[model samples]
Target: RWVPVTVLPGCVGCRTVAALASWTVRDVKERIFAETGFPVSEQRLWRGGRELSDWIKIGDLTCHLFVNMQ
Candidate 1:
């Protein structure tokens, strides 16, 4: 089992939050997938390692993409 990780610079999160809050859904999705190699279906968003409700206010969204390259 392989866990894929992507790291974003500190200010990037802030930019993401701003863009998301402004309703830039497509752009955000593209950015995430591009950075993490995870498609929309394989991705999940989280904050503090806890899953967040879609209706809840989102601070940070985490994406998980696991791969087994064997």
Candidate 2:
């Protein structure tokens, strides 16, 4: 089953993305941009106050994130 990832875009509020867990970090970045129109270059996914690696896999794991933009 695809997992739902929640993203709070600092000031614009939040968007929930339902996607495959197999998607990589870069994959999620694109999806968010596709549906929300947020620029990927301006996208910054954070956890533990650090950005995620592009090669990291979603893997049915916890991928909850918040994004900050310039």
Candidate 3:
């Protein structure tokens, strides 16, 4: 459900949605660094890369991420 924009829109930009598996923390950080030329670190509670750390699915969308300037 992507809205194509030709001319520059207003001050606000359109929102985009994506599935969980298709997302990656490193990809996000790389994109931000490419655009702004600033290094960023992403914090995730999961022990490894982009997956449920514990052997349980207790709740919905339990993962959390925060990006910090580095």
Candidate 4:
């Protein structure tokens, strides 16, 4: 199952992306980096109000990717 995700701010180049339901947070971070040049190390994913773990599988949830500014 492919899960659809949306990135916020509407300026990360990718507003909507797809990933496998079983993909880890790390996997999705890599995909986002490949698509938008956002570094994985600088990114943090959140759903509702909780931070997501890289080892966890992503289901059909809408997650937000926040890039940490140096």
Best model number under TM-score: 2
Candidate 2's C-alpha runs over 4 A off are 1-12, 60-70
**Whole-model Cα lDDT of every candidate shown, in order:** 0.43, 0.68, 0.40, 0.68
Q: Write the per-residue lDDT of candidate 1 for residues 1-70, one digit (tens) a residue.
A: 9964656555333323234443333444456677767685554555446643434422233233221111
TM match of model 1 to true structure: 0.33
Which pairs clash in model 4?
none
The TM-score between candidate 4 and the true structure equals 0.62
On a 0 to 100 scale, what is the lDDT of residue 43 in model 3? 23
Over 1-70, each residue of candidate 4 has an lDDT whose tens digit, in order, gives 9976655565654345677778788888888889889898987887656777778776644344333322
Model 1 residue runs over 4 Å out of place are: 1-20, 24-27, 34-37, 54-70
The best-first sequence of candidates by TM-score reads 2, 4, 1, 3
Q: What is candidate 2's lDDT per residue for 1-70, written digit by digit as tens? A: 9965655457546676765778887888899899888887777776545777777877634634444332
Clashes of 2: 0
**Model 3, span 1-70: residue lDDT tens:** 9964344346353222232544455555445556666564542324223443322332333444322232
* Greater-TM-score candidate between 1 and 2: 2
Candidate 4 ranges with C-alpha deviation above 4 Å: 1-14, 60-70
